[PDB]
Amino acid sequence: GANKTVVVTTILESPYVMMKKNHEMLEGNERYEGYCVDLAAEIAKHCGFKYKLTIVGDGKYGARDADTKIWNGMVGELVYGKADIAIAPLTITLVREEVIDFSKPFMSLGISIMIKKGTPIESAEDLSKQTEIAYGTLDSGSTKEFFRRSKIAVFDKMWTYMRSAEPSVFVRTTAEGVARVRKSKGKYAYLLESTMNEYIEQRKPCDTMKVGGNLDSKGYGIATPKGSSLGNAVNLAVLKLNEQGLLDKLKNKWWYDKGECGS
Amino acid sequence: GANKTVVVTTILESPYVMMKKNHEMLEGNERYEGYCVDLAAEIAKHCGFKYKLTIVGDGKYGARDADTKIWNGMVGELVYGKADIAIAPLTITLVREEVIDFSKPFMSLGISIMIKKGTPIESAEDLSKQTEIAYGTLDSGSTKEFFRRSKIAVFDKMWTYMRSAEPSVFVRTTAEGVARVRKSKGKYAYLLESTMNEYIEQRKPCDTMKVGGNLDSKGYGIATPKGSSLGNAVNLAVLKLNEQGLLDKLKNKWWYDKGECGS
Ligand SMILES: O=C(O)C1=NO[C@H]2CN[C@H](C(=O)O)[C@@H]12
Ligand SMILES: O=C(O)C1=NO[C@H]2CN[C@H](C(=O)O)[C@@H]12
Numbered sequence: 050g051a052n053k054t055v056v057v058t059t060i061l062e063s064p065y066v067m068m069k070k071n072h073e074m075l076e077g078n079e080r081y082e083g084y085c086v087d088l089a090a091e092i093a094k095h096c097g098f099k100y101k102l103t104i105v106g107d108g109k110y111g112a113r114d115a116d117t118k119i120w121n122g123m124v125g126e127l128v129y130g131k132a133d134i135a136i137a138p139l140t141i142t143l144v145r146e147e148v149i150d151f152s153k154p155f156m157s158l159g160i161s162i163m164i165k166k167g168t169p170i171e172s173a174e175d176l177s178k179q180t181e182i183a184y185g186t187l188d189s190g191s192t193k194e195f196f197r198r199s200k201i202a203v204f205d206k207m208w209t210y211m212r213s214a215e216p217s218v219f220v221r222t223t224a225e226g227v228a229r230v231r232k233s234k235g236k237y238a239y240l241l242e243s244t245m246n247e248y249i250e251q252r253k254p255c256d257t258m259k260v261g262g263n264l265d266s267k268g269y270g271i272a273t274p275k276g277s278s279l280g281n282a283v284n285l286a287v288l289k290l291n292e293q294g295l296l297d298k299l300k301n302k303w304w305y306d307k308g309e310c311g312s
Numbered sequence: 313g314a315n316k317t318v319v320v321t322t323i324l325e326s327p328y329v330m331m332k333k334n335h336e337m338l339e340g341n342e343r344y345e346g347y348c349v350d351l352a353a354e355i356a357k358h359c360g361f362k363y364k365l366t367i368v369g370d371g372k373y374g375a376r377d378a379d380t381k382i383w384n385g386m387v388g389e390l391v392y393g394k395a396d397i398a399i400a401p402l403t404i405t406l407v408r409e410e411v412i413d414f415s416k417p418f419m420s421l422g423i424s425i426m427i428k429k430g431t432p433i434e435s436a437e438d439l440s441k442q443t444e445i446a447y448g449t450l451d452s453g454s455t456k457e458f459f460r461r462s463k464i465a466v467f468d469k470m471w472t473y474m475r476s477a478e479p480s481v482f483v484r485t486t487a488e489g490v491a492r493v494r495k496s497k498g499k500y501a502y503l504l505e506s507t508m509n510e511y512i513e514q515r516k517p518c519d520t521m522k523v524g525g526n527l528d529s530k531g532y533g534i535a536t537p538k539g540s541s542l543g544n545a546v547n548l549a550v551l552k553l554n555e556q557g558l559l560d561k562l563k564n565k566w567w568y569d570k571g572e573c574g575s
């Protein structure tokens with residue numbers, strides 16, 4: 050049939066997609082900025098489609114409710130036919146891969162530790178061997194799952210603590226985790242993806258730090274409905290853009306050129 | 313039809329696949345050891361197949377001859393029907409993705425610099441601004457292509473030098489590049505994947521070093537013939553093994569537990 054505008058679903062997560070400060074004055078795709086806004090433009094160019102950016106209606110990434118079996122978030126919008134492509138920091142996982150198609154990674158990352166500067170923690174082992182400093186993860190996401198699935202003693206000890214800690218150590222969003230680190234006076238550490246951690250470390254008030262190495266190695270992928278004809282071209286575009294350096298150019302633009310914490 | 317033993321193609325590249333020292337005394341899959349030997353066993357277990365490891369007949373990874381348009385190496389064995397799956401450090405690239413199916417990455421990596429210890433080079437920029445120390449890449453591979461495709465001034469300067477340097481700065485294999493670093497008295501530096509670089513740094517005679525950060529971010533994938541029914545299960549197995557920590561366990565086993573250069 051005739052071509053139609055492609056509906057892109059994405060999520061407000063800095064610096065991937067942000068409302069421009071003057072968005073009330075703008076319309077359409079021009080309302081948004083960030084790494085994934087720039088990536089969407091490049092993918093559309095390299096696949097030859099016109100597109101409309103939309104923010105996922107429920108504000109969520111995508112998980113399946115254990116009781117109703119309904120997918121929420123961006124994954125749900127793809128699964129149920131409400132969007133054509135998701136361009137966001139959507140971690141490639143087994144459970145999602147079974148229901149949607151993913152490009153090869155456009156960004157690589159791993160689980161990492163965020164502290165308020167001066168917190169006496171250098172490693173996951175340090176967290177696991179003390180109790181004064183609480184620590185947790187995003188409540189719905191791949192970081193929590195790493196701990197749930199681990200057979201490594203340190204990470205098992207961490208999961209046993211986190212899963213039962215009161216008050217809850219799990220947070221609703223990255224912004225909530227960061228705020229909790231910043232406001233808990235060194236008594237909360239946040240486990241999150243290295244990409245977000247490294248971004249926040251270069252944001253005012255410049256009071257957080259990434260500590261230690263990454264605990265694993267994963268990727269973000271562009272997602273399409275399973276079997277969608279768009280997936281092949283999107284995947285080729287990701288590889289081509291990576292090979293020509295464009296993805297690293299965008300990362301440097303949004304993480305470091307725009308850093309607020311010095312050079 | 314009835315199930316058949318799956319033919320796995322792989323390549324002798326340390327520590328991914330190596331002949332055991334006593335291989336003359338062994339038969340079948342037991343002749344080989346390494347990260348990809350262990351990974352093949354896990355993939356076969358998690359997909360429910362029996363398999364035979366084979367070493368690619370021509371000893372090559374996979375590139376297309378510009379004149380005959382014939383694919384060589386492991387990619388060729390898949391394309392032309394001589395093997396069912398390739399389990400090796402095969403970098404996921406646009407040109408290969410067009411002709412074979414790739415799992416999501418089982419290992420993440422980037423281009424890196426190897427020096428003989430004491431060479432006065434800390435970065436790619438350092439290499440690009442001098443001439444006494446020659447430098448190059450594997451003659452057929454993704455590292456060379458990064459330089460060919462770059463628009464970054466430093467990397468463009470490096471490519472302009474490498475492509476015309478005499479004698480050739482390009483090497484046949486990783487082992488040749490390492491030997492050239494080790495034997496050139498500080499006057500050759502080798503650009504190679506971080507995975508190989510980090511392995512060699514922990515091998516006797518402990519005379520090489522990785523310097524600087526990685527220049528890009530890429531992945532190794534398990535490859536199957538395009539459209540092969542095996543690809544779906546293989547990809548799920550990679551994600552599942554990553555999520556449960558097995559891939560990192562194997563990396564640590566083969567890179568660092570077995571390191572020869574101290575603790
Ligand atoms: O689990 C985490 O640490 C996460 N942080 O941000 C979200 C984006 N990637 C993960 C996902 O896709 O589930 C989520
Ligand atoms: O290009 C390089 O630096 C490479 N080193 O080892 C080879 C394995 N991965 C790359 C490929 O698949 O072409 C090759």
Ligand SMILES: [Li+]
Binds near residue numbers: 151
């Ligand atoms: Li999928």
Ligand SMILES: [Li+]
Binds near residue numbers: 409412413414
């Ligand atoms: Li492919």
